[PDB]
C-alpha cells in the first residue's frame, strides 16, 4: 500500500497527514500489518484499520499474534480501538487486558495523549504485555 493509496483511505479523517505518517511508520517496521478500509458497525461508517500479526516472544519462542487496530477519524488525538483476532487454530484468552469481545485494554490506551502517545509506542507495549500474558493460545 503506497502513501497515495493511504491518503485515499483517510479522505474523511480530521487529521489526515498525521494518520498517514504514523501508518507508514507502522507498516514499515511491522511488515505483517496491512492497512484496510472497511465498514465499522454501519455500512456507511468506513474506517481504516491495520490488520495482521505482530511478533511476540513467549516462554522461549516468537508468535505471530493476530490483531486489528481501528483508527478513528480523530486519530491521533483519540486512541485506536484494538482487538485480538483469533484464527481457527487458536482460542482467545479473556483476561486482564482482553475482554469478552477480544477488545484490548491497556494503560497506554487509557491515558492516550497526542503527540507523546503513538502507534509505534502502543505496539511496543503490546509486545511486552502479550509476551507476559498471551491473548490467544493454540487449540489442543
Amino acid at each position: 500500500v503506497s502513501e497515495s493509496q493511504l491518503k485515499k483511505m483517510v479522505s474523511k479523517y480530521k487529521y489526515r497527514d498525521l494518520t498517514v505518517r504514523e501508518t507508514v511508520n507502522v507498516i514499515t517496521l511491522y511488515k505483517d500489518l496491512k492497512p484496510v478500509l472497511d465498514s465499522y458497525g454501519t455500512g456507511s461508517r468506513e474506517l481504516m484499520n491495520l490488520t495482521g500479526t505482530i511478533p511476540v516472544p513467549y516462554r522461549g519462542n516468537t508468535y505471530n499474534i493476530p490483531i486489528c487496530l481501528w483508527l478513528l477519524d480523530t486519530y491521533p488525538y483519540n486512541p485506536p480501538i484494538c482487538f485480538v483476532k483469533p484464527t481457527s487454530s487458536m482460542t482467545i484468552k479473556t483476561g486482564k487486558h482482553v475482554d469478552a469481545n477480544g477488545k484490548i485494554y491497556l494503560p497506554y490506551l487509557h491515558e492516550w495523549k497526542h503527540p507523546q502517545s503513538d502507534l509505534l509506542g502502543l505496539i511496543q507495549v503490546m509486545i511486552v504485555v502479550f509476551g507476559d500474558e498471551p491473548p490467544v493460545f493454540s487449540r489442543p
Binding site: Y63, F137, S138, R139
Partner: peptide
C-alpha cells in the same frame, strides 16, 4: 505471515 499462538496452558 501465518498467525500463531503458544500451546494451551
Amino acid at each position: 505471515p501465518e498467525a500463531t499462538a503458544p500451546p494451551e496452558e
